Structure formats: C-alpha cells, structure tokens
Assembly symmetry: C4
Homo-oligomer: 388 residues x 4
C-alpha cells in the first residue's frame, strides 16, 4: 500500500522462542528437496518465507555430487513457505545467481542476484518480480552481497556489496535503491577494514548491519546507515566477546576501530542486535569451526570494549553443525515494537561430513520474547549414515 517506515524501536529481548524450522535434510532423504546453502528469512506484509541459494539439484540426486562449490550457473535465489523445506515443487525462483539479497518495501519486493565468472560478474536488481537495473563488476573479483535480507525505509532500500580481494582491502559500496532503481551509491567509509555478507535490521529510521571482516577481523565490522540522508558510518563491535569464526579465544578487551587479530582470511556470515543494554550477539560455540550456536546478551557491546555477557541462550549444541546466521524482522507485525529475529544455517555434508559428496543445510529460526523462556537446542536432525 504505502512504503513501510522504520518507526518502531526493538522489543526488549529477554529470551528467544522457536520461530521456524524446516528439517530439510531429514525430509529430503526421501523427498524432492533441493540442495541449498546461504539461507535467510524475509517477510512481506502478509507472509514470511524462507529463502536460499539453490544448487539446482535435489539432495538425493546424482547432481548433488560437487555442491560444496559456491558459484555455478545452476544456482538461483529461491523462496518457499515458512518452515516447509525447499522442494522442487514449492520453491519459487526470485532470480538467477550465486549471491543475493531481498527485501519488501511495503509495496513490493526487491530481489538482487549476482551471477557470472569471478572476473566478470554482474548484479541484476528485480522489483515487483521484473528485472529493472543491472550493475557490472567494478573490481572484477567476485562481486558479492549480503546473503540475507536488506531493509527499506520510505521506499529506500540500502544494500551492501563488495568487489575485490577477500584477503586484503576490497571495494565495498553501499547502494541506495528505490523501486529497483539506483538513487545513489557510496564507497564504504569509517574504520571497518574489510566487509562481506552484511546482516541487517532497522529500527527508528536507522539500519544496522553486522558483517564479516574476512581479511583480518575476529570481531565483526558494523555499518550503520541513515536511509533518509543516504549516508553511513562503520566501525567494529568493541566487545571482547568475539563473534566471527574461526577466531582466537576471547580476550578481556576488544577493538572498536580495527580488526581484532589472531585469524586471517576466513570467517562466517553472522549478526547481532546492537541496542544499548538490549544488545545480543550471536556466534558459533566453537572458535575453530562452524559448530554450535549461542546468543549472548552483552550490554553495550558495540561501544564498550570490555563488555562481557550478562545472560545467554544456547541455540545449537557444540556437538552439532551450524553455519551462517543473519537477521530479519517482521516489519508488518502488530504491536509497538519490532521483534528481533534471526536464523542459523545448519550445514550438513562437505567438508565436515565427507562420506557424502554433497553439501546442503536446513534452517532453524528464532524471534525474541519479553519472557525469560526455557531453552532447547535445535539440531539439523539428519543422520548422514542414511545417505550412504
């Protein structure tokens, strides 16, 4: 109807309740479930759906062999009903490509897919399910974007892209789209030194993105965007509670304007909700691999370089595989505040489970509760041996 405006603040997060879970790998053992990875969740004014990058083959299909690879001509951004698995028969293709983002502006949806060879990729921006704008690679080195939803404010939907090295300085740009057209773009500014896969959310006319510094940081870079002025700033989460992976053990003091050292050229897409005392960080339990997942309440994590946890909640046990994680919220829910939500990608198969030739995942998603709810762990649930 009218463009949505980020007029509410976040609800108080006292715990996390189960929101969605598709048990895709369990079900796909004996049904036509597509192989995927890089999932996320995004809402329309009347529905919330699961999203992911399909690999263009079912898990039991022979073409599942080799799906550990990230970029192929057989990938596409698909969406499907909440908590259902991504099947051949219920998956709606939003666009073709191996890197994506998508968000609804209140009137209709914008989806972006990047495709092409490493030195000649291009982004196609779709709006109202039609292609509207295209952007060619500017650094000719894997043009790539969020892998989770973007956020809109009065028609303006900022999106973070990176083109260039994954192990040195790269060329990150913040594009401001409206109805799929480019209003403006700016090069990354601030103190974040490397940006990849931003996880964003909005509240009170401000959009916050927690990203991945693949080059040197084990703390996460943060980009805060003003969608009206179409400007931004960047820094790192100050807190010593490190949230990338792999990462060194937690120190007692973090870094606010530089990558916290110890691990180079690697990382995992992640997220956080930075809202004063109502601050919660997500991270893998393991400092070595994408194992387990927990939420930690770390008051003022963004600005306090000595901030430590005051509460927490385990989402996935350290004895279970996790993966990417990102933020989304139902901006069209009732009430006076936006309920923070996130999803965790539960990766199965290669490289951790190499008895199978494929790599896929299932999804688990939670939203915040003002109650202090009891906790459960939520594993993918499949038995690899069944696939042998």
């Amino acid at each position: 109807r009218d463009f949505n405006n980020l007029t509410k603040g976040l609800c108080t997060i006292n715990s996390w309740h189960i929101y969605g879970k598709d048990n895709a790998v369990r079900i796909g053992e004996d049904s036509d479930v597509l192989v995927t990875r890089e999932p996320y969740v995004s809402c329309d004014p009347d529905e919330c759906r699961f999203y992911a990058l399909s690999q263009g083959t079912t898990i039991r299909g022979k073409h599942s062999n080799g799906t550990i690879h990230d970029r192929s001509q057989y990938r596409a951004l698909i969406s499907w009903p909440l908590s259902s698995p991504p099947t051949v028969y219920n998956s709606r293709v939003e666009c073709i490509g191996w890197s994506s983002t998508s968000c609804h502006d209140g009137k209709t949806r914008m989806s972006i897919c990047i495709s092409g060879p490493n030195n000649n990729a291009s982004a196609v921006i779709w709006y109202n399910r039609r292609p509207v704008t295209e952007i060619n690679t500017w650094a000719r080195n894997i043009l790539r974007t969020q892998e989770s939803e973007c956020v809109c404010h009065n028609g303006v939907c900022p999106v973070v892209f990176t083109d260039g090295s994954a192990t040195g300085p790269a060329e990150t740009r913040i594009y401001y789209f409206k109805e799929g057209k480019i209003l403006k773009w700016e090069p990354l500014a601030g103190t974040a030194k490397h940006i990849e896969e931003c996880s964003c959310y909005g509240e009170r006319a401000e959009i916050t993105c927690t990203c991945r510094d693949n080059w040197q940081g084990s703390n996460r870079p943060v980009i805060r965007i003003d969608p009206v002025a179409m400007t931004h700033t960047s820094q790192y989460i100050c807190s010593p509670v490190l949230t990338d992976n792999p990462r060194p053990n937690d120190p007692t003091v973090g870094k606010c304007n530089d990558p916290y050292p110890g691990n180079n050229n690697n990382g995992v897409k992640g997220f956080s909700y930075l809202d004063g005392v109502n601050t919660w960080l997500g991270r893998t339990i393991s400092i070595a691999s994408r194992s387990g997942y927990e939420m930690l309440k770390v008051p003022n994590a963004l600005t306090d370089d000595k901030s430590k946890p005051t509460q927490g909640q385990t989402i996935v046990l350290n004895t279970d595989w996790s993966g990417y994680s990102g933020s989304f919220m139902d901006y069209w829910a009732e009430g006076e505040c936006y309920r923070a939500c996130f999803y965790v990608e539960l990766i199965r198969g290669r490289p951790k489970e190499d008895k199978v030739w494929w790599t896929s995942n299932s999804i688990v998603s939670m939203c915040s509760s003002t109650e202090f709810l009891g906790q459960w762990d939520w594993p993918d649930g499949a038995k690899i041996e069944y696939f042998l």
Copy 2:
C-alpha cells in the same frame, strides 16, 4: 469479518455420516507423506482442514525409524487440505513444537505450539500467522495442551493446558486469549482430579471440553467454560458407560465427581457431545487397547450415573487400530444449528505393529445427520507387510 459468536445449539444427532478420510498410510507407502500423530480437524470461515503434529520425515524415509517418540525438535503443527494426506508438498507449518491447539475466531486463526525439553518447555501463541505471546513452563514437567481445536466466542478463545505429573496431581490452567494475547488465566477448579488433552466444542455461548484423566480415571473429566465471564467448572461424566482406554469393564453406576477406578497412569485423548438426550459418547471398543471405535447415544450421560446406551454406531471395527479422537464443528456452516463432528486417529506401526520401525496414522472424520443412516466401518486400510 466479525468475531464468531456461539449463538446456535447442536443439531439433533440421529446418526453419523462420513465427512473426511485421508488414507494417509496407504498412499504414503509410495508417495511423500509425512509421518504424523495427534491429528485433528479445524475450520476457518471458508475452509476446513486436517491438522497434526508432523515428525519431520516421510513414512518411507529412513528417519521414520524412531517416530514412536512423542517429543523431538523435528515436530511441528501442520495443516493441509481436507481429506488429502499430509504430504511434504501440501503441508503448511502453523508453528514448531510437540503439543498444540488451534482455532479460528471468525477474523483470523490462533495456533499454539509447545516445545522444549521436559523441564523447560514453553508455549508460543501465534495469531494471524505471527508469534504474539509466549508462556514459560510453570511446573517444569512437560507443559502440554489439547491436541485438538480450541473454541472462540466474541474473540475470546479459551485453551486448557497442564504442566506437572501425569500420575498424580498436576497444575492445569485455563487461559483466555483474545487476538493471541492473554486476557486472564485461572487454575483448574471443580472436581476433575487430573486433566490432559481436552476435546472441546461450543454452543449457545458455552464451551464444553471432554478430557483425559491420565492418573486415575476411566470415566472422562469434563470442563465447561463460560467465555464471557471467563469462568469454568469441572466434573466427570456420571455415566457407567466408561470412555477412556485402557479401562475396566462397564459397571451399572458411574462416578460424577471422582475418577472411576480400575486403571491408573494411562489413557487416550477422547471426546463427547453432552446435550441432554442428544448426548453421544465416543470410545474404543477394546477396554485394553486402542482398538476399534464406536459412538454411543447415552441420554444425560453427564449427569445420570446410571445412564446406558439407547442407540449406537460403530466407526472402526475392534479388529482395526484406532487411537486419539476429538471434537470440532464448522461454526461457519449455514442453517440454524451446529453440526457435531469428530475425528478418529488410526494409528499404525509401533507399538502394536512392530515389524516396522515407525509410528504414524491416518485420519477418519464424521459429522452428525438428523437422518438415521446405515453404518459402515472405516479402517486405516494399509497393509503393514507392504512396508517390510
């Protein structure tokens, strides 16, 4: 449009006509049908659908091994088109969890799913397909609810929950929700001594629930709710025609305010329509197991401790497996009265049929007729041997 009000009385039940049957286990022998249990039926103003707790795997899938277990992280409340089987491709997830209830208030639907470990479960109340309220376990011992539809009156939808022992006194609460928010809750009152899995229906601004006294009763406890005053009473069906299972043989006089003895710590979800002479009780034919199913007209069963049958109808032969049963009605049908309906869960597999490693069910459902219709029996129809 407007909240539905229970303005009609029940139609006269002179017999039962076939309403729906999904033949899920038969069909699922060679199609992607989800393993389920704890099914029910519930209507929206423009459609009636089947509901159940999925086990997050197909019947032929290898992950079907172990589905005799009731609570796992892979369960979810799903709904699907009337008389179709619950397939991977047509099942809509309403929420995640291992205990549920759901009902439409005339404007939109409220669904409730409980999840978590035994000592830390929580209920999430969804309204208009969005999470609205959460309730943490109060007795830290398997927070659980109806496993069949709730009933609404002018926006108020009462729901019965139990937390605590299944073999001694527990903490049952009646919650009064409106638009997914809690208006009030009260602890169970009256003479019912233990409450589990209430089966409810409404007529003339009163909601009647027939439940399961797992601890000591072979007669069924009854909770009658006033959704306007938001108050209730409880007692037992007085009739000597005992309807739980397992149960002792029928005596000549029942008990009105105490559990009828003979069988402890066990039972099955069941239901009844208590409307003076127009009273009909459902029960398994077997007093020992979930075998067979019959409807018995027992005038004034609720208040007459010597009431015996005056008419009956066999639904499932004693040589066929039955299971849970519950009430629902299409509150949005035409006419001057509400047509009583019920479903019977036809459980197949473990523990009765242990040649297979799974446990699932199909559904059969009937509604009342003012005619005196001929009767047929309605078995699940599948051949276990085909699954070997």
Copy 3:
C-alpha cells in the same frame, strides 16, 4: 453470482475437436498418480476440471493391488486441474465414497458421494464444500448415482439415483436439489425399464440424460427432465444404432419404449446428444468389450426407429481400450450456444490386462466444432510391460 439458467440451445455439431487429455497412466508409471476410475469433467464459472473416484493409492504403490474392486472405504471423489493427471499432490477431495455426481449451479458447487456396505449405503450431499443433506438407502442394494456431472437450472439441480437390483426392476428416483437441500423427489416414470449411471446435459430449460439399462437393454434409456416443473419422462433411444456394451449387432429397426434384447445383466456408462438432425451418439466400436470409441451422427436417433448414421468420427481405435463415457458442457462460455462435450474413460489393467494387479484409467475429452475437422485417434498411450 446468480444461478445459471439453461437459456441456450446446442451449437451445431459438425465434428469433434480435442479438449483435454491427461495421459495419467503413462505419467503415473514414474510419478505419484492416484489410481482412479469412473472419471468425468465438470465446469465452474471460472474453471473446468477433471473428476474421478480415487482408489486411495498410487498406481505404482503396492496398495494398487486389488483396485479392480468398485466399492471400498478408500475411495473418494477427487477433482484436479484440466488435463493434468490426478496426483496425490494436486487432487482435491470433494467427498468420500464410491459413487458420485457433481455440478455447479452458477453460485457454487454441489457434490454427492455415496458410501457404505451394499445393504446400508447412504448419500451425503455437499454444497459450497460443506455437507448439507443425507439420504439413506431405500432399497438396501447398492444405492448408486450418475458417475458424471449433474445439471442445474435456476438453482435446481436434478440427480438420478438407483437403489435395488442390477438384473431386474430397481427403484430409481429423480431428486431435485437446490442449495444441497431436497426440494422434491419422484420415482422413475415412463417406459425406461432399468436405469443406471445417467449422463446428462441441458439446453433451453430442459435436461436430457442418456443412461444404462443394465438389466436388458442394448439401446440406451433416456430421461428428460423439466427442472422448473420438476417433472420428467423416460423412453429409449429408438435408433437401431445400438450404443451400450456388450451388445448384439445393429438391427435395421430399434425399440423406442422397451430394451432392445440380446444382452442381459451388463452394460457401460455412456451418453448422447439428442437434438433433431444435430444428434450424435457415442459408443464402443466393439460389441463385445470396452474397446475403441466412436461418435456417430444419427439424425433423430431418439424418435426414429430406423435412423442410421450420416457422418461419424473415430475417437479411440478398436485396438485400444476405452470404458465409461459421459457428457458435460461449459455452461459459462461465451457465444450464443452451448458447445457439446464428452469424455471417454480409457481403462487399463484388470480385467483386460491382468499381467498387472491394478485397474486404473486416463481421460480423453472432446468438444464439438462447427467446422468439419480432420480426425485422430486418442489412446491411453501407456505400455503395460513397463509396469511389470
């Protein structure tokens, strides 16, 4: 919107064009297609769909063994998109039972399914997808109905039922329903001596049904109904071009008011369009079995006992299996006349092809053209050997 009225006459039939074909058995060899039989086609104001009695199992499923049987608790009337096959995932259950009819009155649809044991069957009449009326068996000997669409005029939808012997006089009734309620019913009148499976159509406020005299007639009985006066007449098609099956060879003079002799206690559901010179009869090519299918223009067939063909069109070769056939028309099409249509059930499996343990069918459907179109034959197309 408003009830449809049969205000148009039939279009001139100069030939038949292909309308729909689902290739169900071919496709079902490797997909989840339900076993069916007794199919038909019926239109809603905005869509035309295929209908049939499912057997509650897929063709490749092990439960397909035994589907030669006509009445079981696993059957149901299902409908699905035009020319798609009846799959587990796209079939919508209209009601439960082993004999049916269905028709749209312009506002909504009425569907009728009969179920139960041979001596205690009952019909449930659904309207607007809700059960409204029930009728108990009156002769306690396989209450049965059309197996093809009924026809409505200003809300009144007549339906022909038969209860009683299939090899002697039976009790046939014409019920006049409106909004699923019984307005009136009358016992069969006229000279038709036995009635089963009527195939009907309407034009100019008159409904014509061509049925099956199972007891003695090889010519087909005809019931003409006035839906306003709610009265009818019956006779036989006078023409010597005999259209039931099995049947004796064609004579030079038929019978107008009595069954044409030669074959007893057997037959096949069939149809015709009786409109003066614009008269076309359908029939199997074989006089011995349900083999082949042809349309013959037989001017004044209904009233001329010496009428012979003046034109024809082969639909299915005598070297291919056919089966039931019936009439339907899209009463909501544009133009000044109703275009006559029909379907032919292409039965595969038992008893003619007993190397497989199942019995199913596919559907082929045609409508009339005012052009004189070239002809093709339309076989089921499946290879039984593939199923071995």
Copy 4:
C-alpha cells in the same frame, strides 16, 4: 483491463543479463520433471511463465523412451512458473497438441495447439482458457505454427501458420485473431520463399517475426506485420552473418530477397531484434549442429547486405548443446521502452546423446541491459552418464 497497445520502442541493447534458467534436466534426474521440447517464455500482465510441449511422461519414466519423435497424441502445451522446471505437479496444460503458440492481449490469454495425423491436423484456438475457434488443415501436410509467443495490439493477435511441404513451396497464412475469433487471414506475401516457426515481438504498433526457411535459406526470412491494417510484408535478413543451422560459412555479402544457398531441407527455430543500429542476431556457434549460442550486434542487419558484427555476447559455449531460440518481452513492465528478451532451448539426449533413449531440454533466458555487462556461459548442466 484494457487491450495492450504496442506503444513503446525497444530499449537500447548494450548487453544481455540472465533472466531465467530452470535446470530441468539436472533436477529431473531425481524428481518428477516432464520430458519436453519446443519451449518458450510468455508474460501475462502480472506474471511471466515458461511454456513448452510436454511429451506426456517424466524423464526418468520408462515412457521417455522414444521422445525424439515430434508429434504424438501424448503431447500438450504446458506452462509453469518462471525458472522452475516443468514438473507433473506444477505444469498447467493450456491445450492438447504438438505445435503451439500463445500470447496475452492485456485482458486475457490466447493459446493455440495443433493436433492430428500429418494429413488431417487441426488447430484449436483457446481464449480465456476456453476453446473458441478451430481451423482445419488446408494443405493436409503437417499444419504447424510458431513454437513461441504471438504478439497482440489492441486485441488483434496475428499468428503465422504453415501447411504443406518442408522441402518446397508451402502454404503459409497469417491469421489475425481477436478474442480467439478470426478477423481475417492472408496468404504469405513478399519475397520470403518458405516460412516455419516464426519468432515475433512488437514495438511501436509493428510486429516483427524472424522465421525459419527450411527449404533453402541459411539466412532467416522476416515477416513484418501491421496489426491495425492487418497487412504484412516479408523478405530475408540481408546481412552476410548467417543465422540458421546447419548453414554454410559466412560470406561477405548476404541476400535480401532470396534464401542464401548452401544448405537445404533443414534448419532450427531462431530469432532476431531488427531495430537499426540497435540490431542483434542470435545463432548457434556451430554451422553444422545445434551447438553453442551467441548474440551478435549487427547494425542494420535487415537491410544491409554487407553488415557485420560490431559487438557480441556468448550465451552457450560451442562445447554445449543448444537448440531452438525465440523472442518474447514483458509488455507490461514499467519504463519507457520494451526490454528485448529471448530464450534458448538446451536439448539433451537424442540424437546427439544417444546413450539415453529420450530427448528433452532445459531452458535459459536473457533480457537486454543498457549496461555493458560481463558475460558468462549457461549450459544445461546435466551429466548424461547419471542417466545410464
């Protein structure tokens, strides 16, 4: 709402961006994907879908054996969601037949399917999903049409048909339909000597069709239609850049009004966008077989007999199989110009890959960009060996 009018001109084509890709053969290796061929794409005012001629069997199905054949009673025009594969469960049958065309006029869709034996075929024209007009074969030698979308202007939708020899002069007709009824038809005029499978598009009240001269031409015949005057002209693309297949090597001067010689009695459906300097031609890279695919910017190709490429883009490598290609545009997109689009049919199986007994394809589709985008190649992606 109102009939669409071709009021815009083509957007400037500076490159081609990926639009859709269904990876049908890859996915169908382990899911119920229908065997097809002769695909295309066509838009409705609110959705764009993939179209193709099904073979009435899945790829893994045993009935896939023999699908190299073009005309059978088991074929049908089906459509399905953009970039999804054509599955048994998501494919909507538009009509029955082995040659087709389809287009939306702004209000509703017209679909045409031709069926029958070679000497007695007939076309049935459907409008608003109902059969409206039928046309009998006029030359009794494989009545055939476009195999890609038609184009409408103010309700008038011209369609090119050919009946007669494929290796000598034939009888081509241009039919002008409106609401599925024939307004007028004319015999082919101009200098094109043989016409088959026209690929059309519209801009500024003119419809341009690039077809296939199967008899003698390696250059492509072009028919330009005035849908208001309902008249046309025909010629050949003058350019020496030859675009049919097989074909001789490119000369330095082409032919404007006669077939360019060198290859007889063969060809492939193809297309082009003829718009002055904004002219782009599609063609297989191989001059011998349906291998590879490229787009070439050939300014004034239609009228300049010496025109050579000034820019290009590879779509499919010469080491990958291609096939048919055709034009379509989303006439209902926003903006001031129509964005040129095309699809390429990626044929797999027989005759090029005869280790399998079937012939099918997948689809890849692109639209133009005003940017100069980097290029990628888009193969079908399946491994034939997996099917052995």
